[PDB]
Amino acid sequence: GHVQLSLPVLQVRDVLVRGFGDSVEEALSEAREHLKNGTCGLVELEKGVLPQLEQPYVFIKRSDALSTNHGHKVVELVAEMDGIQYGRSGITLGVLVPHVGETPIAYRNVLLRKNG
Numbered sequence: 001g002h003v004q005l006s007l008p009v010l011q012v013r014d015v016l017v018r019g020f021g022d023s024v025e026e027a028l029s030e031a032r033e034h035l036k037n038g039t040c041g042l043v044e045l046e047k048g049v050l051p052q053l054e055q056p057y058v059f060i061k062r063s064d065a066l067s068t069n070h071g072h073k074v075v076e077l078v079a080e081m082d083g084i085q086y087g088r089s090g091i092t093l094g095v096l097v098p099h100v101g102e103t104p105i106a107y108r109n110v111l112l113r114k115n116g
Helices: 024-037
Strands: 004-009 040-043 059-061 094-098 107-112
Touching: 024 040, 024 094, 059 094
Parallel strands: 004 040
Antiparallel strands: 004 107, 040 094
8 A cells, every 4th residue: 555656866965955944844844745746856864964964854764653574665754853863773765855956866766655
């Protein structure tokens, strides 16, 4: 189940603007909406990445809400200020950014929770 969705994958060094906003719930909402528009892209979480983003790093984690093994890499939209949790984990599949033409190197599919 869930909706299937794709995004581009951009370099954090081309993505001049990696903030959707400057609070958690802001960036989470705007992310959901830049996804709804389709003007979002993905940035992979690597060791030097957080202290180049703004702050409310809109993460994707592989849906810790289930107990089954048989599926695609499903994820869900989440956000943290210091990246206290999630970003500093191995769940976590990247951080979203507003796509402004930064030239992708790749694309990253996921599914997207839709209750009804």
